Structure formats: structure tokens, C-alpha cells
Ligand SMILES: [Cl-]
Ligand SMILES: [Cl-]
Ligand SMILES: [Cl-]
Ligand code: NA
Ligand code: NA
């Protein structure tokens with residue numbers, strides 16, 4: 001869970017309601033997954049962890065709601081989010 | 095001003111108080127500059143423009159306050175912000 005946040009590639013956030021930390025390990029797995037996600041209190045924790053460890057936080061309200069509504073922690077991201085997350089990962093990971 | 099926002103490389107935001115759109119034209123100028131910046135309603139406008147045009151919005155509270163406190167529109171960014179902005183530009187621009 002939130003112990004894994006320092007290893008997140010990015011966090012997708014909706015201020016100040018939602019945060020979704022994304023994991024990506026292209027050396028091993030073809031797809032990104034959700035490390036941890038939450039709303040309110042828990043979102044604030046995830047945000048605070050990311051800031052501490054220098055993990056990039058992207059504002060994307062529709063994507064954050066979508067990850068929250070359809071995804072699950074420790075599960076590869078929903079198909080409906082795949083391309084938008086990939087855009088983020090494309091530059092972040094270069 | 096806010097007409098130039100579609101050409102921004104990134105927006106630095108503090109929810110939901112501050113937005114700073116950053117311009118970068120490494121083909122011509124050595125340094126990034128501030129395209130447009132504001133707080134409250136003006137921040138909301140800048141954010142809305144960026145979302146519409148697919149400009150990446152990064153949540154960085156200290157940097158946003160710093161750009162706001164020391165920078166000016168149509169001026170190369172303050173020295174105190176140069177390295178943090180460069181980190182953002184480094185991946186965004188790859
Ligand atoms: Cl939660
Ligand atoms: Cl879950
Ligand atoms: Cl303003
Ligand atoms: Na957004
Ligand atoms: Na050019």
C-alpha cells in the first residue's frame with residue numbers, strides 16, 4: 001500500500017479529493033498498475049508521500065475519477081485508462 | 095497572456111490557488127519563461143485552458159508559490175526556480 005508510494009512512477013490527482021499512485025515496471029510487466037489510491041484523508045497521505053520522495057504528481061480530474069471508479073490496488077490499470085496513463089508514463093519515463 | 099496557454103510546455107499548480115504556465119523554446123532561448131500566472135479565478139482560467147489543450151499540469155505547491163512570489167509574466171524564470179522547473183521540463187520534453 002502506501003509504503004510502496006516512494007516507488008510510484010507518477011501520482012494522478014484530483015484536488016484535493018483523489019490520488020492514484022501508479023506503478024510501472026516495463027522490465028518485467030507489460031502494463032502499469034495501481035499501487036495505492038484513495039480519497040480525502042487517504043488522498044492527502046498519498047500526496048504527502050509522493051512529495052517527500054520526489055514522485056511527480058499530475059493534475060488530471062477525469063483520469064483520477066476514472067482510475068478510482070474502475071481500478072483496484074495491485075491490479076493492472078483499467079483498459080479505459082490505459083492510453084491516458086501511457087501518455088503520462090511516456091514523458092515521465094524519459 | 096492566457097491566449098498563449100495552448101503553447102505552454104507545462105503548468106505548475108497549487109490546488110486550487112495558483113497556476114503558472116511555463117514557456118520553453120530551446121531552439122531559440124536558453125531559459126524557460128512564464129507565459130501566464132495567477133491565483134483564484136485567474137488560476138482556474140489557466141487550468142481550464144491547459145486541460146482543453148492537453149498541456150500537462152504538475153502539482154507542486156512550493157514551486158508554484160515561488161514562481162508566483164518571484165517571477166513575472168513574459169520574463170525568464172527566477173534563478174531560485176530554475177532547477178525545479180528544469181526537472182519538470184526534462185521529462186515532459188522527451
Ligand atoms: Cl480512501
Ligand atoms: Cl482497491
Ligand atoms: Cl491573478
Ligand atoms: Na484536470
Ligand atoms: Na521553434
Ligand code: NA
Nearest residue numbers: 051153154155
Ligand atoms: Na506539492
